[PDB]
Amino acid sequence: NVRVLVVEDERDLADLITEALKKEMFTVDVCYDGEEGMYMALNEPFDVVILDIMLPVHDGWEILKSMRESGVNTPVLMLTALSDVEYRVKGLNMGADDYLPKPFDLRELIARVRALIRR
Amino acid sequence: NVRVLVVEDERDLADLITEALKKEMFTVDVCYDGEEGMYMALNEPFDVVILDIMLPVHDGWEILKSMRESGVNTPVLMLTALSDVEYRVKGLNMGADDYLPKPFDLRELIARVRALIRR
Ligand code: BEF
Ligand code: BEF
Ligand SMILES: [Mg+2]
Ligand SMILES: [Mg+2]
Structure with a gap:
């Protein structure tokens, strides 16, 4: 019932984040670069998008603006x-x-992601 | 127009925040205690409520809890x-x-405030 997109280039951290989210029973798709990140954020439906800034190809800034420019208010x-x-x-x-x-503290991250979904 | 409620027992700080907000074009209502803040929060409509926690008569935990229990999803x-x-x-x-x-950095406060009312 909850799909979360994760875009983070440091694979191990990205996987750490993903496992934690899945443990909350969320469907999680993870990208290790801004190329697929952009694609996923603009073509697939999500409830929340966790975005790293410094990424290969496209940075978090670009991904966010492209989403907003495309009407994706996720x-x-x-x-x-x-x-x-x-x-x-x-x-x-x-x-x-x-x-x-x-x-970041993992407990705060989960708490903030949950704050964004219920909202 | 946007309505913002401010509950802070630190008068100087509360007034400082109230000024900065209206400067950003916000209809601000300021409370200096948990008694005035409890009422306003549970009876008057707002777009965003800024809650201090340690306050006289009613603490922020109380106000926040009373709000959610009463269906106030502000x-x-x-x-x-x-x-x-x-x-x-x-x-x-x-x-x-x-x-x-x-x-806190006053810039981060109104940045977060506008991001919240942005939904
Ligand atoms: F931490 Be990310 F590279 F902005
Ligand atoms: F008095 Be508040 F909790 F900073
Ligand atoms: Mg990075
Ligand atoms: Mg206080």
Whole structure:
């Protein structure tokens, strides 16, 4: 009943995130690059999109804007090493629904993803 | 026009936030205690509620809990000095949509506020 898209280039972390989400009983599709990320985010239906910023081919910024520019209002959560507040504002102002810098606490990530779905 | 409710017992801070918000074009109502905040939150309509936790007569946990139990699905942002991640998770789990600890960057506060009312 809940499909989550994960876009993160650090495979092991991406898998860590995915397993945690699946343990919440969510259907999770994971991408290790911004190319497939973009494709999945623009062609497949999701309830939440967890997005890394710095990615190959297309960065999290581009993926978010393309989604909004295409009418896809799916809730977006950015998870990235760009932690400076200025970046947080940039992501949010651009259309992200939440922004959680790395390193992150797994409990907070799940809590925030759940906050986005029920909403 | 957008309605924002502010519940903070730190008058100076509360007023500071109230000013900044209206500057961003927001109809703000400020409360300095949990008594005025409890009423407004459970009886008056808002687009987003910014809830401090430690307050006289009624604490933020109480107000947030009373809201969700009464069917008030209004977006809620917790702005509190209870910064520990475990408090953040509890806040999100209880029904808050976002949780921002103190001290905070005023830019991140309105960025998050607008992102919340953006739905
Ligand atoms: F490379 Be991501 F922005 F952490
Ligand atoms: F008084 Be609040 F909880 F920062
Ligand atoms: Mg990356
Ligand atoms: Mg207080």
